[PDB]
Ligand binder design. Structure first.
Ligand SMILES: O=C(O)c1cc(C(=O)O)c2c(n1)C(=O)C(=O)c1cc(C(=O)O)[nH]c1-2
Ligand SMILES: [Ca+2]
Ligand SMILES: [Pr+3]
Length: 562
């Protein structure tokens, strides 16, 4: 019972959230102001729900809420439907995964989409699955790509104009990134768009594939040889949608392999934001945040539409906080660069950006080719591969006009080595050691003014930040930490105003809605993601955190709101 019109209405209906992002554009702003800075001290848990199964590791989903039911996912490709008032399980679906799934960076899933009477998610073996919302039974299932080649799906899918859209993951395995659209009611494929230059895109009619143009025009323009056959650029975080331009906004992963000396050229459309026509999957514009990447600076980070006035004229902009340390503001009608500036305190790989937004490179920060030796010499670089910001989404507060960015301060030693492609095997050609830049913190929650280009406030955390952000009309910003807290801040000043220890690192993006006249806040807990794969000093810092897997629901009691 979710229509396309209801999706387009988020977040205006207080009782429900039917989108990843609290609105198709991904602003993660709630207009609810029952809960505010003056009464958040009265927020407390009302129930929890354990995912069970002796299956923990990272838990990244944002729940959706419709008709008093919460729909969410867990690690190892599981879906849960849970009563929003009581916490009682309605049903659970556990995908049967093969033993040879190939995630790069933990067995995570970032959420469902809803349409009609169905619940949709992508699996770690690169299937797209539709479940009946009331029973959890499978209605249809389609293979998006071959998991034996290194494809997986970790992102939440999205609905645009009645079409169900998913990307894929796997750049660390040399997959060919692609975005594809499906009929939500029966899983019929509608179109497919590669994100690597040289591959053909298609529309589908009557079960036939109809050519619909080569991505990037022709193979070999910004890649050498046949490197584009394994080029990566996986659109692994999903994307968002702008109704004003009718464009899907999707970022793309790093080019493969990590050894950039094997692939001279800009390597399109890796490490880029793409704007696509949802009718047919054609790319209307692109902006490449890291041409010829050498640092696994994936360009997937969300591109969030927002509007502002400049010298009397209305600007249709979009902002993104990139892995590479720059915060970018683009004209979302045509992809043109407006401004770009660091949102972390140290960037070594570039000294700035040119007038089109292309980096001005510092070539001493690119690791050298191995040449005669087994490994090249290491170079120190900031940010580290894990980025100034990774998967975890920022949020936009319409009242303050600021973005709230979960960032990290770390560099690395990185080196290169030879690497041959082998189907199903890692395709790196580089190694690294992460080196935090500061002894007493890594994570920094930052409030950024995208019009002036200035940081307004910052809040430091000992561990890295790895969780999505929520902001609300009550002058609140919420986000989780690996220490296990859900925390709230004053959106104007950054002062901490509330927190709760959930018992496991919090990665899920928080969500808020209203039921029976009371405001609820919920988040998914359970530590994991890429940070536990880092050795060295980062591992020492996070060693005492424990795994989990739990949905937490909090409420402000009606009698305490005033
Ligand atoms: O290039 C890719 O296809 C791809 C996929 C993913 C993924 O699917 O989650 C990550 C990465 N790259 C990546 O580079 C990275 O640092 C990363 C961290 C995480 C995580 O959930 O903590 N996922 C991924
Ligand atoms: Ca369309
Ligand atoms: Pr990557």
């Amino acid at each position: 019972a979710v229509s396309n019109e209801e999706i387009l209405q988020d977040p205006k209906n207080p009782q429900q959230i039917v989108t990843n992002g609290l609105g198709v554009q991904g602003q993660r702003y709630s207009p609810l102001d029952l809960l505010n800075v003056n009464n958040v001290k009265e927020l407390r848990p009302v129930w929890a729900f354990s995912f069970g199964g002796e299956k923990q590791r990272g838990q990244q989903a944002q729940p959706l809420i419709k008709d008093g039911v919460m729909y969410l996912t867990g690690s190892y490709s599981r879906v849960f439907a849970v009563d929003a008032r009581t916490g009682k399980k309605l049903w659970q679906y556990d995908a049967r995964l093969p033993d040879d799934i190939r995630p790069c960076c933990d067995v995570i899933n970032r959420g469902v989409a809803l349409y009609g009477n169905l619940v949709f998610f992508g699996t770690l073996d690169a299937k797209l699955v539709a479940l009946n919302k009331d029973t959890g039974k499978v209605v249809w299932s389609k293979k998006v790509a071959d998991h034996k080649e290194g494809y997986s799906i970790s992102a939440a899918p999205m609905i645009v104009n009645g079409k169900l859209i998913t990307g894929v993951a796997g750049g660390e395995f040399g997959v060919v990134g692609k975005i594809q659209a499906y009929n939500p009611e029966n899983g019929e494929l509608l179109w497919m768009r590669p994100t690597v230059e040289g591959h053909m895109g298609y529309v589908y009619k009557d079960g036939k594939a109809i050519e619909n143009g080569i991505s990037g025009g022709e193979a070999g323009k910004t890649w050498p040889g046949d490197l584009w056959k394994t080029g990566g650029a996986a659109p692994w975080l999903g994307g968002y949608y702008d109704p004003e331009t009718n464009l899907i906004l999707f970022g793309t992963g790093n080019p493969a392999p990590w050894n950039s000396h094997l692939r001279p050229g800009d390597n399109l459309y890796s490490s880029s934001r793409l704007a696509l026509n949802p009718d047919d999957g054609t790319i209307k514009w692109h902006f490449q945040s890291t041409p010829h990447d050498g640092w696994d600076f994936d360009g997937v980070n969300e591109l969030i539409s927002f509007n502002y006035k400049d010298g009397g004229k209305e600007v249709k902009a979009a902002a993104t906080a990139d892995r590479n340390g720059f915060f970018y503001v683009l004209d979302r009608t045509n992809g043109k660069f407006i401004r770009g500036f660091p949102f972390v305190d140290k960037i070594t790989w570039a000294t700035g950006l040119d007038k089109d937004g292309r980096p001005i490179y510092n070539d001493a920060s690119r690791p050298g080719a191995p040449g005669s030796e087994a490994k090249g010499s290491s170079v120190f670089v900031a940010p580290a591969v894990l980025g100034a910001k990774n998967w975890m989404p920022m949020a936009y507060n319409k009242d303050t006009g600021l973005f709230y960015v979960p960032s990290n301060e770390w560099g690395m030693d990185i080196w290169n080595e030879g690497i041959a492609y082998k189907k199903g095997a890692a395709f790196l050609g580089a190694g690294f050691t992460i080196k935090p830049l500061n002894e007493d913190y890594i994570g920094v929650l930052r409030a950024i003014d995208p019009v002036s280009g200035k940081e307004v406030w910052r809040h430091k955390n000992y561990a890295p930040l790895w969780g999505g952000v929520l902001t609300t009309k009550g002058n609140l910003v919420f986000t989780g930490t690996p220490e296990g807290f859900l925390q709230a801040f004053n959106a104007k000043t950054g002062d901490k105003v509330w927190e709760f220890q959930t018992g496991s690192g919090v990665l899920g993006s928080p969500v808020t809605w209203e039921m029976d006249g009371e405001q609820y806040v919920s988040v998914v807990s359970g530590w994991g993601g890429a940070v536990p794969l880092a050795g060295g000093e980062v591992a020492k810092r996070v060693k005492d955190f424990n795994q989990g897997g739990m949905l937490w629901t909090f409420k402000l009691p009606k009698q305490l709101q005033q």
